[PDB]
Design a protein. Structure first.
Lengths: 299, 299
């Protein structure tokens, strides 16, 4: 048994990381087939980032201003294109190591693995969640262009590319078509994230993992209703729970013998009373970075 | 910025995972050069595990009783050997994907990444620490033979192979020469782990990471002495801090402008007063699964 925050194996993604320099700026790129993908602000200096006109800045660049390096080997660029906030460098060479892949736009509250990279080389892997306010609480040191992914069977679902640190120290980025998650733009300006609310369906699934693993102290004699739970939920900045969410927890309810609303009531009491210095699954707070699918696949 | 629990990239290890069946028992093996390494209790049934005579059980096996499968391809075994608690299956084929590697016996309190595997295929990666009592708090579902590793440059330092779950639900295993960490044996019996004490040098380094990342509330007006800290440490089941440990934190002291003993006193006050419902680096407890080297390499 046991329950750890688990990343996907990263080998299929390592073989796709390249380095992209343009001017004095260098960052990570994703080489899939004959296209390298990277943050378009690779064409910006620091002062550029204050207020960039990407079209105007990009017009001043030709194919040969982009230096794409894959390991010690070097790629030739026969075309560049801006798609939203990503630059797409068309190269002459298919990446031999291209895995099966899809581009996916995930939903707030879903999880994925990040291969943090520096100058095109892999440095680390960790598992994180897209917050409800479309930020990531990450470790991004240089790391721009690192990508997030899920892995279904033999196929890599790329869902995130890192672009920036907000003045508030959390991180924002795009899907692999270049559209930011949330209301953020690739400009060094004050931008607000909305209120960082807790992913209720994830906490519940994690409480199930707890039960599956023998941590049962938090289970209480009460029950509750969806409405009355949400009334408590919104008072604690918890995402509202819907009936789709209840449906998603179904397998976990079947395994443990505990109905979703009973668990809901145990969570209510937890929120209203605290944890009394007691831990759950070795944690002193409620964890919301496991989806129901994560718990199932792990357990 | 930001601070996440980071695993090493696992691609170099994925290409080494194979499946080893002998009788009805199947588990993970590590294929390096022309040797497959795996837990010797792959030769045991469940009832065998109650009290196995490994020599006697192994004598009843020839090379052809071992079914080593690497992906969909199949290896031929031209020799088997018991080295302590690991079986070493000599095969006819060098693993083409063999990275540069070393076998290392790590020390209590050091950290490494685990590629949890099932039937020879990679399922996940996470970062963990060898506890002071030589157990691992892991997620081992089937996972026997999964290995732990660090990665220095281009070279994989293999340091751990999983063998068993203790009745207490924590995990024990061996180095890659077959010697268990701790006093555990590969037998399904009651075995005790000693008291699980906290890795003091790791907590301190994590408090430095906190400071580096702007979490500073816990810094106090006090200071203390090594002896008087250890007096507090041993009362809270914290590993004694030595002068080697103080020396290891040196770079972190240089970066932050905070001397080790001042941080020691902030940690004292934390231990004696609690956290007052306040978090550090997004955690409500003191984390001891980052070494000083981890903090440095990340930060």
């Amino acid at each position: 048994s046991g329950f750890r925050k688990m990343a996907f194996p990263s080998g299929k993604v390592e073989g796709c990381m390249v380095q992209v320099t343009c001017g004095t700026t260098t960052l990570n790129g994703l080489w899939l087939d004959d296209v390298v993908y990277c943050p378009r602000h690779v064409i910006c200096t620091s002062e550029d980032m204050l207020n960039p006109n990407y079209e105007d800045l990009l017009i001043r660049k030709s194919n040969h201003n982009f230096l794409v390096q894959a390991g010690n080997v070097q790629l030739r660029v026969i075309g560049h294109s801006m798609q939203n906030c990503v630059l797409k460098l068309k190269v002459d060479t298919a990446n031999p190591k291209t895995p099966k892949y899809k581009f996916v736009r995930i939903q707030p509250g879903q999880t994925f693995s990040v291969l943090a990279c520096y100058n095109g080389s892999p440095s680390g892997v960790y598992q994180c969640a897209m917050r409800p306010n479309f930020t990531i609480k990450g470790s991004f040191l240089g790391s721009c262009g690192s990508v997030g992914f899920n892995i279904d069977y033999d196929c890599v679902s790329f869902c995130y590319m890192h672009h920036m640190e907000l003045p508030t120290g959390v991180h924002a980025g795009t899907d692999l078509e270049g559209n930011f998650y949330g209301p953020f733009v690739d400009r060094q300006t004050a931008q607000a994230a909305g209120t960082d609310t807790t992913i209720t369906v994830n906490v519940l699934a994690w409480l199930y993992a707890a039960v599956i693993n023998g941590d049962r102290w938090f289970l209480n004699r009460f029950t509750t209703t969806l409405n009355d739970f949400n009334l408590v939920a919104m008072k604690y900045n918890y995402e509202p729970l819907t009936q789709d969410h209840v449906d998603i927890l179904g397998p976990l309810s079947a395994q443990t013998g505990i109905a979703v609303l009973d668990m809901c009531a145990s969570l209510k009491e937890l929120l209203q009373n605290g944890m009394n210095g007691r831990t759950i699954l070795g944690s002193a707070l409620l964890e919301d970075e496991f989806t129901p699918f994560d718990v199932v696949r792990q357990c």
